[PDB]
Structure 1
Amino acid sequence: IIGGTECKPHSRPYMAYLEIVTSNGPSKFCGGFLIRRNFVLTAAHCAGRSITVTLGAHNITEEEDTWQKLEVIKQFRHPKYNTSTLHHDIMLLKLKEKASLTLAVGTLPFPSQKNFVPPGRMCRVAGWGRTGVLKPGSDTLQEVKLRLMDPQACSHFRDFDHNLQLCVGNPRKTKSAFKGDSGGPLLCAGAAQGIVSYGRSDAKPPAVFTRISHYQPWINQILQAN
């Protein structure tokens, strides 16, 4: 999270830190959120051979009682997930056991929106991602306020699609989501509306976020069958 501020410890109880294991490389990390006691929503590109979820965290370098490290038994990537266009970058992770509901760990009900969030509206995204282009990932959960842009603002991303994704982050500001924040939720009015997906390597906003609403039907499908 570039140009943001350190969250008030555990003020975002649904946040999930993800350590991802791959075959030919060191572990990678991503964000995500707890939508069910045993289900975490995140970005499809964050998929791996195996994944470990850590809920209730703030400073990920220091283990505390609020911590709940859980085993992921199954990774559900969207069937149409495309690595070249980056469309449908959404994944559901089913947990081994259900997490415990604490002050530091809870779910973020994938809502019920009466109307789509009009650009111009400010929303917020949190994460443990890099805080700059050549900066490392943050030890503590960062948070920043970003403006929902008109789809035109994301035109340069040749494969960006309004129906499928959200354009987030005013280009006139440096604030934005960055490497590492992927999988985290974008919250507008307290309701999850997006998932950090991608942006320019040089960090110039806007950034591309998956439009959750659009996949609500696929999400309920996976849930209902597992």
Structure 2
Amino acid sequence: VVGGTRAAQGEFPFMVRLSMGCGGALYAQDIVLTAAHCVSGSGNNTSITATGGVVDLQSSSAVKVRSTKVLQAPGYNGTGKDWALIKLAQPINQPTLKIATTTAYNQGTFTVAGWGANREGGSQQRYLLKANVPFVSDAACRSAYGNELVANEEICAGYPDTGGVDTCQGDSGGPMFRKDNADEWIQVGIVSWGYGCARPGYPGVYTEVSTFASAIASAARTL
């Protein structure tokens, strides 16, 4: 995260750090929702480690759990559908993050979090960082990215005019979320891509969770 601040321990307990340099959210205690580009494909896989329970990755209180299987969005090829599920060998006993099933919350100011770089070319972070990024319309986002932006599969956020606050290398897969009508966090995006980080005119692009919610839920029932 570029232009963020340290998240308090226990603030976003659904966050998990993934071994390949990605973030993720606890969709279920033993199912991590992350980005399709964080994994190589679907299948049995015990090589991924998810670290949960702590903002400080060096904490002795960290819970490190290995994966058992990965389900990457069917048909993923780098043009949208940027979601994936990772089944864990054991559950991480922390609150989960509900995903948006409608587009009612695809607006307003969102919150993002991760252990990714806090500057372009920077190193990964020991402590979880968070930031608030405003929703950016498809039109404004398209003025920057043109056809690279996938209509109805991607939502953008950040400051189009002046930049300064954004997700960056290492934050991919993390959830982008906001409060729902019941004062509970709800996931509207998955950190996906962007040109650089926090640059004026280039907002961050996120997987539009509402579009994939039914697919994600069905896929999770099979793990």
Structure-1-length-normalised TM-score: 0.86
1:197 counterpart (179, 192, 199)? 192
Quick one: which of 143, 147, 151 aligns to 2:130? 143
- Structure 1 gaps of 5+ residues are 21-28
For 1:99, the equivalent position in structure 2 comes to 92
CA distance, structure 1, for counterparts of residue 53 and residue 150 of structure 2: 34
By how many angstroms is 1:137 displaced?
A: 1.3
Amino acid at match of 2:11: S
Question: Within 1, Cα distance between the matches of 2:197 and 2:56?
Answer: 26
What is the deviation of 1:116?
4.1
Q: 1:153 aligns with which of 140, 159, 177?
A: 140
Counterpart in the other structure of 2:2: 2
- Provide the secondary structure at the position in 2 that maps to 1:213: helix
- Is contact 1:17–1:57 with CA below 8 Å preserved after alignment? no
- 1:69 paired with 2:64, answer yes
Per-residue deviation, residues 124-183 of structure 1 (Å, max 9, x unmatched): 100000000132111100000101011012213222123101011112231111111100
C-alpha displacement of 1:109: 2.1
Quick one: distance in 2 between partners of 1:125 and 1:162? 21
2:14 equivalent to 1:14:
yes
138 and 218 in structure 1: CA distance in 2 versus 1, 3 angstrom threshold: same
TM-aligned CA distance change 1:63 to 1:114, over 3 Å: same
Amino acid at match of 1:146: V
Amino acid at match of 1:192: Q
**Alignment of 1:78 onto 2:70:** no
Number of matched pairs: 208
Unmatched runs of 5 consecutive residues or more in structure 2: 180-184
Alignment root-mean-square deviation, CA: 1.7
Aligned to 2:182: none
Is 1:219 paired with 2:216?
yes
Q: Which amino acid in the other structure matches residue 167 of structure 2?
A: A
- Distance in structure 2 (CA, Å) of the matches to 1:202 and 1:32: 19
Counterpart pick for 2:178 among 184, 188, 192: 188
- Evaluate the alpha carbon distance shift between residue 192 and residue 55 of structure 1 in structure 2; reply closer, same or farther with a 3 A threshold: same
Report the TM-score when normalising by structure 2. 0.87
Instruction: Show CA shifts across 1:175-221 (max 9, x none).
Output: 11111110001112221100000011354240110001111111122
Matches within 5 A, 1:34-183: 34-48=26-40, 50-60=47-57, 62-65=58-61, 67-83=62-78, 85=79, 87-100=80-93, 105-111=94-100, 113=102, 115-118=104-107, 121-155=108-142, 156-157=144-145, 158-171=147-160, 172-183=162-173
2:163, 2:198 within 8 Å by CA — same for their partners in 1?
A: no
Tell me, yes or no, if the aligned pair for 1:167 and 1:206 is still in contact at 8 Å.
yes
Letter aligned with residue 215 of structure 1: F
| Contact 2:17 2:52 (8 Å CA) reproduced | yes
In the alignment, the residues of structure 2 paired with residue 224 and residue 3 of structure 1 have an alpha-carbon distance, to the nearest angstrom, of: 37
Residue in 2 aligned with 1:25? none
Q: What is the CA distance between 1:113 and its match in structure 2?
A: 4.5
Partners of 1:16 and 1:33 within 8 A in 2: yes
**Could you say if the C-alpha distance between residues 202 and 223 of structure 1 is closer, same or farther in structure 2, counting changes exceeding 3 Å?**
closer
Q: Secondary structure at the match of 2:169?
A: coil
Stretches of 4+ aligned residues off by more than 3 angstroms? 111-114
- CA distance change for structure 1 residues 132 and 112 in 2, over 3 Å: closer, same or farther? same
Percentage identity across paired residues of the two chains: 30
Take 2:133 and 2:100, find their aligned partners in 1: how far apart are those partners?
A: 20
Other structure's SS at 1:137 match: coil
